[PDB]
Design a protein around this ligand. Structure first.
Ligand SMILES: [Zn+2]
Lengths: 17, 209, 58, 176, 142, 37
RNA sequence: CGCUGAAAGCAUCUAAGCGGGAAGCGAGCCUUGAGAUGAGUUCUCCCUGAUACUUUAAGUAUCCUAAAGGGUUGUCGUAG
RNA sequence: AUGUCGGCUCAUCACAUCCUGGGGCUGAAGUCGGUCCCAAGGGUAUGGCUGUUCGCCAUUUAAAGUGGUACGCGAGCUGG
RNA sequence: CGCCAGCUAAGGUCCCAAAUUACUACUAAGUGGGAAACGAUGUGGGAAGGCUCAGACAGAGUCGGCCUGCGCGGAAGAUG
């Protein structure tokens, strides 16, 4: 089954440090 | 089919006695004169070429002027061709008049549409706008997606996008003739005719009749 | 290239490349394809001789 | 095979013109012409035509058999000719010969009129009967088929254009 | 020393005229294709068109075996989405007689600049006549 | 019409025929008519 | 769905042959369209000078000519 | 470092067809249906509730197809 | 390692693409060049059998099994 992934960091560009 | 080469004068109405208004475009057909007869033997198809109106002599090239001289017509504002299908026989110099459409109920009119310049998908293709508020960032009249990811990995040909709108040959079909005025060389045609006033219009008996 | 040219020339002289090489082998003619193909271009008559010799061997 | 091996007699007053593979049979009732298959060998032994296969051809006997029966129908055609008899059944259904056309009232809002082909001749003994007649058995059959096709017999009351022979299986409508 | 090379300047190309009437499309095409390359000549040089001008007449009368007349399909894609166009052999013989043979030959010729050049030397005609009397084509039973 | 991989006589008046490369059963009984044998 | 019709004496729309038959298919309607290098066709218009030079060409150079027409510039456009 | 659900925008294809077209059988009288075959040309709801897809509901429609396309589409939007 | 020499392996020899002809069959399905159960007077071969000029089968053959070769249907997918 589809397991909801964590593909991206929680803080998004343009702030992504 | 044989037709005339008019100039769109403008729109108006014709009140009928029964109190119906009829939106009419007024096409002025200055006498059209045959400037060349194309035959199957000479050209591989039967057509007449016609000119209309007048061109300032000064504005006529030698190449143009010889072609008219050969017909023994005076130079007109351009040259337009009408294929013949009925084995109809015309000679050069022969005039065509509004009286051609004395029996014709409906005609098909063709002109160059008015030019709207570079227009976006919203006006050009009736694309829906995106949300005006609710978060939309700079993408209100944006066209949306233009495709579908890795497959096919490219934009398909004929995809509706922004671009030049108008200024194109357009034919409206089955426009009724309200009135032929032979004296004033007018056709009164119900409804809208392509292009602005002053534009050349080709009028022809309706093909779907 | 040679084989293609020899085949052209042999077939103009009424024998396949495959039959011509067999013919020559049977006739004990050991002219290489490089020479044969040179002959086919530059001395058409000699090629025809060789073809006639080849035919006789078959 | 069997049908081929049976020869076709040429009755006196039939003028058969073999043109190799072509056979222009002529008679009283008209002139029928037909090119046989290359596979068929035809010959005029006495006042009989004989049909048999070409040498080395597959399904030559089958081709030979059809050609026999074809020629036979030509010969019968030019002497006696063929007649097909359509019968109309149903209230207000009527036919009438108008010119070279069978007009039929078949309960359609439009009027139905079927132009007979060249060589075919229809009569109407009654309004409810038609008689298509000709020399070419295929044309006759075709025409009667076309007329029948306008309103083929329904299965509940038999109504429509039927072949006089034709038997029309009649079901009763589902109970309730 | 070096194998002879045909020179584009010097190569002698002869005009021939072939009647397609009653000839198996493919079998005809393969012969024409070899003649256009000049595989039939001892001067055959792969990088040179030393082939022969082929005129074909009665192209509309080219024959095909089996149910190929009704089943051989020619495809074209317009490059617009869903832009695949099919025509059968029989219909293409009606519409554009000449295309059938030309397509046949085109397939059998090499791809690229030279192969396009070779095909240029094929002059296919549907009728029995051709406009190249001046080239004085020799008849060729191919 | 019954389109089936298995066409076959359903009754004594059924008759199998190949017509344009399709096996077909044809019968006085309309219900017995079949193809795609 | 047939007609005629053998193979298979019958039967059979099919093997030879001849039909009917869909909003679908090719045309038909509108638009683009000869970069269709396979570059098409037709009509009309314009240019009928000298010389030398060479390893003589679809040659080069000089002089004289500068056409039909195209542009740039200008006033502009329901064209941009 | 190949952004992941749903929506929005914009789609494109398959056909196992929802509608419309053509058919055979029917336990098809008619009006309707059922079922199967042909057919992919065009067409193919808006709302209430929920982040929902879905679903239920209301009211439509000729019909509210089933799927593929990185469960199409965040260098196009949104971010519940 | 060099060679513009020759022979062969697998694989091939209509044209792309180097190289083949002759002969004997079979297949008609573009089978070859995807797909099964099963269905089917497709067609080729083989060895038997039943019934029949005291009349078979529907005035001469005819019917059905078996061993086999090759084919047919069964066979619907998404950019072309
Ligand atoms: Zn039955």
């Amino acid at each position: 089954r589809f397991r909801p992934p964590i593909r991206r960091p929680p803080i998004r560009p343009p702030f992504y440090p | 089919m044989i037709g005339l080469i008019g100039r769109k004068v403008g729109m108006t109405r014709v009140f009928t006695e029964d109190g119906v208004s009829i939106p009419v475009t007024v096409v002025e057909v200055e006498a059209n004169r045959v400037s060349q007869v194309k035959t199957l033997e000479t050209d591989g198809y039967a057509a007449i070429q016609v000119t209309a109106g007048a061109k300032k002599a000064n504005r006529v090239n030698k190449a143009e002027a010889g072609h008219f001289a050969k017909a023994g017509v005076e130079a007109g504002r351009g040259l337009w061709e009408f294929r013949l299908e009925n084995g109809e026989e015309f000679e050069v110099g022969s005039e065509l008049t509004v009286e051609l459409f004395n029996e014709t109920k409906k005609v098909d009119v063709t002109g160059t549409s008015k030019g709207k310049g570079f227009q976006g998908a919203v006006k050009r293709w009736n694309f829906r706008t995106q949300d005006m508020t609710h978060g939309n960032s700079l993408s209100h009249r944006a066209p949306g997606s233009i495709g579908q990811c890795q497959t096919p990995g490219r934009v398909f040909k004929g995809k509706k996008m922004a671009g030049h709108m108008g200024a194109e040959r357009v034919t409206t079909q089955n426009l009724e003739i309200v009135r032929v005025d032979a004296e004033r060389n007018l056709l009164l045609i119900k409804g809208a005719v392509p292009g602005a006033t002053g534009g050349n219009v080709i009028v022809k008996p309706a093909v779907k009749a | 290239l040679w084989i293609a040219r020899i085949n052209a020339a042999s077939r103009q002289n009424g024998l396949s490349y495959s039959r011509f090489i067999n013919g020559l082998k049977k006739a004990s003619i050991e002219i290489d394809r490089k020479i044969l193909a040179d002959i086919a271009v530059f001395d058409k008559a000699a090629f025809a001789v060789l073809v006639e010799k080849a035919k006789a061997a078959l | 095979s069997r049908v081929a091996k049976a020869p076709v007699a040429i009755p006196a007053g039939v003028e058969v013109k073999l043109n190799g593979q072509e056979i222009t049979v002529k008679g009283a009732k008209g002139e029928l012409t037909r090119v046989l298959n290359d596979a068929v060998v035809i010959a005029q032994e006495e006042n009989n035509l004989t049909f048999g296969p070409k040498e080395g051809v597959v399904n030559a006997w089958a081709q030979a058999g059809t050609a026999r029966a074809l020629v036979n129908n030509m010969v019968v055609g030019v002497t006696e000719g063929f007649t097909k008899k359509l019968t109309l059944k149903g209230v207000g259904y009527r036919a009438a010969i108008k010119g070279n056309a069978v007009g039929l009232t078949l309960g359609f809002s439009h009027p139905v009129e079927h132009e007979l082909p060249a060589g075919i001749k229809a009569e109407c003994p009654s309004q409810t009967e038609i008689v298509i007649t000709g020399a070419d058995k295929q044309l006759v059959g075709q025409v009667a088929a076309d007329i029948r096709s306008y309103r083929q017999p329904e299965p509940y009351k038999g109504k429509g254009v039927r072949y006089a022979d034709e038997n029309v299986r009649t079901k009763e409508a589902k109970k309730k | 020393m070096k194998t002879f090379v045909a020179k584009p300047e010097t190569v002698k190309r002869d005009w021939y005229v072939v009647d397609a009437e009653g000839k198996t499309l493919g079998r005809l095409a393969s012969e024409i294709a070899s003649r256009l390359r000049g595989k039939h000549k001892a001067e055959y040089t792969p990088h040179v068109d030393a082939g022969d001008y082929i005129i074909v007449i009665n192209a509309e009368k080219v024959a095909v075996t089996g149910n190929k007349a009704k089943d051989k399909v020619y495809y074209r894609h317009s490059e617009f989405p869903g832009g695949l166009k099919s025509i059968t052999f029989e219909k293409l013989i009606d519409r554009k007689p000449e295309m059938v043979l030309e397509l046949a030959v085109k397939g059998m010729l090499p791809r690229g600049p030279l192969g396009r050049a070779m095909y240029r030397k094929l002059k296919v005609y549907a009728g029995a006549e051709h406009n190249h009397v001046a080239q004085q084509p020799q008849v060729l039973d191919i | 019409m019954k389109v089936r991989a298995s066409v076959k006589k359903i009754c004594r008046n059924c008759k199998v025929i190949k017509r344009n490369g399709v096996v077909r059963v044809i019968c006085s009984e309309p219900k017995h008519k079949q193809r795609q044998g």
